[PDB]
Amino acid sequence: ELEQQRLDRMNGMIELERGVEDLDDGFWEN
Amino acid sequence: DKKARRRTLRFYTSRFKGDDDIPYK
Amino acid sequence: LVSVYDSYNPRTILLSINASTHPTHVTKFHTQDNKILATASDDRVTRLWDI
Amino acid sequence: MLHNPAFISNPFQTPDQVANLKTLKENYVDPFDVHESDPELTHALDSSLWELASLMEHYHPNVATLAKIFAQPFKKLSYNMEDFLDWNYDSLLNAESSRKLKTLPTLEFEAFTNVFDNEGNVYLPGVAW
Amino acid sequence: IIKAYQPKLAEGNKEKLGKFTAVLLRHIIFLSNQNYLKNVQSFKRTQNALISILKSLSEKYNRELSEECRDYINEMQARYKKNHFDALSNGDLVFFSIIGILFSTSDQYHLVITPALILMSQFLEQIKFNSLKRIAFGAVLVRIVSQYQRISKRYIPEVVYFFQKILLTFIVKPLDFENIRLDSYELGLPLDVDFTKKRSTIIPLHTLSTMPVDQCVSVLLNVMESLDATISTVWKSLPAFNEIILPIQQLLSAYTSKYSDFEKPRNILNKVEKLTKFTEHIPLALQNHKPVSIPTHAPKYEENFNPKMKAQLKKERKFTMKEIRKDAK
Amino acid sequence: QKALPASLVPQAPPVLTSKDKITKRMIVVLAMASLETHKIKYVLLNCDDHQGLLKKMGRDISEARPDITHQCLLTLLDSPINKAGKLQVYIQTSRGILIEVNPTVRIPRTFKRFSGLMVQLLHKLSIRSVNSEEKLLKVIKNPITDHLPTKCRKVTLSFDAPVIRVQDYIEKLDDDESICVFVGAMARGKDNFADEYVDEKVGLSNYPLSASVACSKFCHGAEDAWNIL
Amino acid sequence: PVLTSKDKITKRMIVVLAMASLETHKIKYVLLNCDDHQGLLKKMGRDISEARPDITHQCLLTLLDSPINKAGKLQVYIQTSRGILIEVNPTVRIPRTFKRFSGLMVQLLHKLSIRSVEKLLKVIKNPITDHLPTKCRKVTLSFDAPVIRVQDYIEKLDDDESICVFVGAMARGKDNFADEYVDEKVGLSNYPLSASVACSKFCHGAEDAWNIL
Amino acid sequence: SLVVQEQGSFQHILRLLNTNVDGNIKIVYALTTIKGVGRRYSNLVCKKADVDLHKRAGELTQEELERIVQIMQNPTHYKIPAWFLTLANNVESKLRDDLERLKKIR
RNA sequence: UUGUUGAUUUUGUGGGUGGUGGUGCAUGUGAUGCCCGUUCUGGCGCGCGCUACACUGAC
């Protein structure tokens, strides 16, 4: 379970299971 | 200089799948 | 798109041809042979069209 | 530059065509000259932008996401550079602190007996206290 | 202190231990800053022991530790804004390692790794690296970031930039590398260096505070060993490996030509040659997009189809009006 | 050597319509569809749900199965050929409805909601989208031939007919013409429903084939033939 | 001959309708449906989106009626999302109407077997692997996996072997149901396919590959 | 070799008053899409802003667009004329009562 | 802490439990196989005529 979680976190899974693309909304504009 | 062209570019700036059923109601 | 119009009649389009998806920067009628029209595009192919 | 369609492998491509594609791959050489000073003679159009592809693996996630755009369709007409020009290391750190979304910290299940190498498990071999 | 204030003993002990987790981390960093060359063994028996206790505390108080870790990242950055390398100390180098121990480095996003890993990259580039102290500091920094990406294997351009200048710094120019910006030209290693004696490549942290030829060679070997590993792990996978390794190959060639006995660059150069041979550098193909289907629209319909009031009022008038006329007739 | 297209962005292929006759396409005609309504509210007559009423109406409940028509549409519309915009569907109901099925339509998969739609299509003579941008199901004037493209090949499903490979068939046919396959949604009956329009009849498998299975076998062969993938 | 799980030597095209949403609910015991029973499933707490046994029905129709079954080269397994494995005898002719089909499943799940006066439908013990042929290729259907040819894939595959396809009967879900058993994941087409369409696609290729016609 | 147009390139899309307007559509009928902006109102705006109506929306320069925005947000300041800018149920009950009495007579 | 009461509870930290659960099987028994409440408050048919779906058109 822990190893599978690490692989998911590596591929862009964020535990607030949001994604890296969600973060990249509005960072550059401001 | 950034502020001047920061103004100009403001005007420049502007599916059912596979086995999904139509929404119920 | 290359479009052919009657001079002094802007309303009516005679012939409309899609030379290419890329810009068509040059369009000229052939001086000797009236029927044929030459078109050059950013596709880098100069198609020779006829009416 | 971002894609040469001649080197695509199509499943409908016939076995003789597959053999031809293999030979084309073998004989390719990058023709871009870095020392030529005349930009019209560098033969850039005949090369490819492998460097941008590597940036998709850039350590910064946002930079990787920006680099990933070349892998996506070019729907956007243009990008406003004034939102991109004046970024510094300080700005990147400040933006990271001022993040809209907050996440829960995660921990490492793997355990290291010693952080630094001596002069069982060493996290940072080659360095000592 | 942890035993005397366990969560079960009294209410609020969790918070006290949570604050103690932050306090312990600063103590671990604080001791490293203090001189310990006199009693390195005793310092080693406390420095690792406190980290183990911090690991147990982090398991229960990661949130408190994370907040303190972020504060240190902000504080040091502010100190770097005013003191630059003078702000950087051994405790900083110690500090970064502990996050690798106590946090998951192999994440695309993390609260403490990403601010820190941004911050190592700034050091690997912004700092001048014009002194053997400063080069040795960078050598430790490269190793830390390398361990951060030990599984992720993400590409860090600063590591490429760092390696180029350091390798060229010890050969100062040869007049062939004008694209590499050096910050010191007086660190050129002498030709008489043997490069056959067995010199330790491990860089002690305490020796930094002290900081000649042997020391310069040892720093070079540690940096160069990190170079060989990075080619093996990260750059080998990257599509632009030939472009990335091309400047490094030229610099390593100068090392072999100037120093024939000096073996490792030949090992790296031979190793680099093997990778370029096997790797097939074909033009990239990324604009293949899957064909998009025709649109799909749901139908609009009534579940039980039937084969406002003013209209209903008007409808009733017509019927009543119809009856009445037939009544009058 | 050839210059690349200006826009490499994928664009949805045009939705085929009866008005356009030049483009090549697979036309599938689900002939002998049992699709009829009657007040109880109007409900789609079924072989099993409504037995007594059809007995009162005097028709055989054996040929009172709109389920078969439903399954054929499901596999036809969900086939990749439809996703490629190269297939259009027509339904010839037993009393004489010709129904144009827009390739973009997404019929409900459950039969009860399918039946709920069909009674409405028969009464309003057409169906609109939820966003009200296109008409998905429309009743159209017979004969089917006028709707069919000008240059076209017409065939039916005949079990007695010789067994032919659909992929080999389509490859041998020409590139400007189009293929019409008349599938009998009827459970059982003589294969002469479309004889007046067609000129030849072909078999696909020596074993009997269901309408849903047969039409799926057709489209799969064309996708292999046309590399629709 | 009618293929059975007992015989492992014969080449056959096995297909597994994994994550089948067949469930019986007593207020009488009836097959749960996404539309028929919404509030009842809410009381059970299960999402109504994953409550369509129609998917499993439709796949069986195109599957059982395919020519390959008529040639006796096909056997079907169904793995219920609850964890129930069902063996479908190739000789069965399941009802075409769904409401009747639901009546059979409730009989099957509670009686554990259907006999006609060989059991046409049988509940069998997990794991699925033991029932499969000794030498057999395992694959699934993945949208993300590379697109391949069923005809070319079967042709390049051996002869003494047999082929397994774990088709996901779910409306939506992660494609990891059969990861534990299967060795590779393959895509059939670039475009999306329904479960009924995909197994119809795969069986058509086997008919083309093995010349079943 | 170096040519730069001062006016600028054509704008396929523009953002005015928090509304996306197609450059292909003309100034009047591209501005009509904005909520509260009709054909006559857009025409009056274009006349007040001294922008040639025969132009496309893409052609509009920065100053022209900013002026048009000022026309929208400040109409009065530029002298835009002001003119330019249960019982039924009871009746139902009465009718129903009349109907019942009509039945009573019959 | 109860509702006067007397350590039965309350608080904080850890923490095992599917169980007045069903269903069949073997002469009740089985470390049986298989899975997984309470009380009220409401509940049209037959027909005419006219206008539109634009470029032979709109302004």
Three-state SS letters, chain E: CCCCCCCCCCCCHHHHHHHHHHHHHHHHHHHHHCCCCCCHHHHHHHHHHHHHHHHHHHHHHHHHHHHHHHHHHHHHHHHHHHHHHHCCCHHHHHHHHHHHHHCCCCCCCCCCHHHHHHHHHHHHHHCCCCCHHHHHHHHHHHHHHHHHCCCCCCECHHHHHHHHHHHHHCCCCCCCCCCCCCCCCCCCCCCCCCCCCCCCCCEEHHHHHHCCHHHHHHHHHHHHHHHHHHHHHHHCCCCCHHHHHHHHHHHHHHHHHHCCCCCHHHHHHHHHHHHHHHCCCCCCECCCCCCCCCCCECECCCCCCCCCHHHHHHHHHHHHHHHHHHHHC
F211 token code pair? 């309408």
Interface test mutation site (partner B, options E290, E294, E296, E304, max chain B beta carbons within 10 A):
E296
- Taking CA G148 as the corner, what is the angle to CA G147 and CA G150, rounded to the nearest 5 degrees? 135
User: Which segments of F79-141 does DSSP mark as H helices, in order?
Assistant: 80-83, 111-124
What are the CA-CA distances from residue F72 to residues F103, F214, G33 (Å)? Answer: 14, 9, 22
What is the helix (H) or strand (E) element at residue G24, kind and residue range? strand G24-25
Give the C-alpha separation, B9 to B13, whole Å: 6
CA of A24 to C1' of I31 (A): 57
Please check whether residue E318 is in contact with residue E326, taking contact to mean a CB–CB distance below 8 angstroms: no
Please tell me whether residue F112 adopts helix, strand or coil conformation: helix
Give the C-alpha separation, E48 to E35, whole Å: 16
E231 token code pair? 């080619």
- Considering only CB atoms, A21 lies closest to which of D65, D100, D103, namely D65
Known binder of ligand: residue F191? yes
Give the C-alpha separation, E148 to E141, whole Å: 11
For residue H81, say if its preceding peptide bond is cis, omega within 30 degrees of 0. Answer: no
Interface test mutation site (partner D, options F1, F4, F171, max chain D beta carbons within 10 A):
F4
- E151: nearest CA partner in chain A: A10
Give the C-alpha separation, H71 to H60, whole Å: 15
Place of tokens 């200048």: E165
D128 token code pair? 């000592």
Give the C-alpha separation, E218 to E310, whole Å: 97
Please tell me whether residue G213 adopts helix, strand or coil conformation: coil
- Taking CA A27 as the corner, what is the angle to CA D63 and CA D64, rounded to the nearest 5 degrees? 15
Do the strands A18-19 and A13-14 form a parallel or antiparallel pair, or are they unpaired?
antiparallel
Interface test mutation site (partner F, options G204, G211, G212, G213, max chain F beta carbons within 10 A):
G204
Which residues, 6 or more positions from D43, have their beta carbon under 8 angstroms from its beta carbon?
A: D31, D32, D33
What is the helix (H) or strand (E) element at residue G100, kind and residue range? helix G98-111
- Taking CA G112 as the corner, what is the angle to CA G109 and CA G118, rounded to the nearest 5 degrees? 130
CA dihedral E48, E50, E52, E58 (to 10 degrees): -140
Give the max Cα distance, chain A.
38
Please tell me whether residue F135 adopts helix, strand or coil conformation: strand
Question: In chain B, what residues touch E299 (CB-CB under 8 Å)?
Answer: 22
Please check whether residue G45 is in contact with residue G38, taking contact to mean a CB–CB distance below 8 angstroms: no
Which regions of H18-93 does DSSP assign to beta strands (E)? Answer: 19-22
Place of tokens 């560098």: D42
Please tell me whether residue F49 adopts helix, strand or coil conformation: coil
Give the C-alpha separation, E148 to A2, whole Å: 18
E298–B22 CB contact, under 8 Å: yes
Please check whether residue G166 is in contact with residue G18, taking contact to mean a CB–CB distance below 8 angstroms: yes
Q: Is F217 exposed, middle or buried (0-12, 13-18, 19+ CB in 10 A)?
A: buried
Question: In chain B, what residues touch E303 (CB-CB under 8 Å)?
Answer: 25
**Residue (of F109, F195, C34) closest to G54 by Cα position:** F109
What are the CA-CA distances from residue E32 to residues E26, E40, E75, E138, G103 (Å)? Answer: 10, 11, 17, 18, 76
At residue G121, what are phi and psi to the nearest 5 degrees?
Answer: -120, 130
What are the CA-CA distances from residue A5 to residues A8, A12, E63, E113, E151 (Å)? Answer: 5, 11, 19, 17, 14
**Interface membership of E59 toward A (CB under 8 Å):** no
For helices F111-124 and F66-78, angle between their N-to-C axes, nearest 10 degrees: 100
CA of E59 to C1' of I8 (A): 39
Please tell me whether residue F74 adopts helix, strand or coil conformation: helix
Give the C-alpha separation, H38 to H35, whole Å: 8
Count Cβ atoms below 10 Å from residue F200 Cβ, excluding itself: 10
Given in angstroms, what resolution was this structure solved at? 4.2
Protein residues closer than 7 Å by CB to strand I: E 7-8, 11, 14, 60, 307; G 82-83
Give the C-alpha separation, H28 to G201, whole Å: 54
Percent composition of chain D: helix, strand, coil (DSSP 3-state, to 5) = 35, 10, 55
Give the C-alpha separation, E303 to E308, whole Å: 22
Do the strands G163-168 and G137-140 form a parallel or antiparallel pair, or are they unpaired?
parallel
Please check whether residue G34 is in contact with residue G192, taking contact to mean a CB–CB distance below 8 angstroms: no
C-alpha R_g of chain D? 23
Which residue is nearest to the C1' sugar atom of I13, using CA? E8
Asked if chain B contacts chain F via 3 or more Cβ pairs within 8 Å, the reply is yes
Cβ density class D114-129: b for 16+ within 10 Å, e for less:
bbbeeeeebbbbbbbb
At residue G80, what are phi and psi to the nearest 5 degrees?
Answer: -65, 145
Which residues sit opposite C27 in a β-bridge?
C39
Which residues, 6 or more positions from E196, have their beta carbon under 8 angstroms from its beta carbon?
A: E261
- G59: nearest CA partner in chain B: B19
DSSP code of residue D17: H
What are the CA-CA distances from residue D128 to residues D122, E173, F93 (Å)? Answer: 10, 32, 86
Question: In chain H, what residues touch B10 (CB-CB under 8 Å)?
Answer: 15
Which residues, 6 or more positions from F25, have their beta carbon under 8 angstroms from its beta carbon?
A: F16, F86, F87, F88, F149, F178, F179
E144 token code pair? 């830390």
For chain H, the chains sharing at least 3 beta-carbon pairs closer than 8 angstroms are B, E
**Residue (of D42, D11, D7, D43) closest to D28 by Cα position:** D7
* AA identity, residue E137: F
Which regions of G93-202 does DSSP assign to beta strands (E)? Answer: 113-115, 119-124, 137-140, 163-168
Cα of H98 to nearest chain E Cα, Å: 9
Please tell me whether residue G139 adopts helix, strand or coil conformation: strand
Give the C-alpha separation, F75 to F218, whole Å: 11
For residue G127, say if its preceding peptide bond is cis, omega within 30 degrees of 0. Answer: yes
Which residues, 6 or more positions from E100, have their beta carbon under 8 angstroms from its beta carbon?
A: D108, D123, D124, E144, E147, E148
H15–B13 CB contact, under 8 Å: yes
Give the C-alpha separation, F46 to F54, whole Å: 9
E25 token code pair? 């981390």
- Taking CA H95 as the corner, what is the angle to CA H92 and CA H99, rounded to the nearest 5 degrees? 135
Count Cβ atoms below 10 Å from residue A12 Cβ, excluding itself: 18
Binding residues of G for S-adenosyl-L-methionine: 141, 168, 173-175, 188-193
Please tell me whether residue F37 adopts helix, strand or coil conformation: strand
Give the C-alpha separation, E155 to G164, whole Å: 41
Asked if chain C contacts chain G via 3 or more Cβ pairs within 8 Å, the reply is no
- D52: nearest CA partner in chain E: E240
- Taking CA G189 as the corner, what is the angle to CA D67 and CA F26, rounded to the nearest 5 degrees? 125
Give the C-alpha separation, G56 to E35, whole Å: 73
**Residue (of E235, E253, E252, E251) closest to E243 by Cα position:** E235
At residue E136, what are phi and psi to the nearest 5 degrees?
Answer: -60, -40
Please check whether residue D93 is in contact with residue E77, taking contact to mean a CB–CB distance below 8 angstroms: yes
Structure determined via: cryo-EM
Name the interface residues of E facing H (CB cutoff 8 Å).
309-310, 313, 316-317, 320, 323-324, 327
Tell me which nucleotides of strand I come within 7 A of a protein CB: 11-14, 35-36, 45
The topology under which CATH files domain H13-78 is: Helicase, Ruva Protein; domain 3 (1.10.8)
Asked if chain G contacts chain F via 3 or more Cβ pairs within 8 Å, the reply is yes
Please check whether residue E87 is in contact with residue E123, taking contact to mean a CB–CB distance below 8 angstroms: no
Compute the half-sphere exposure of residue B7: CA atoms within 13 Å on the CB side of its CA: 8
Say how far residue G126 (Cα) sits from the centre of its chain. Answer: 15
Cα of B23 to nearest chain E Cα, Å: 8
For helices E213-230 and E132-148, angle between their N-to-C axes, nearest 10 degrees: 20
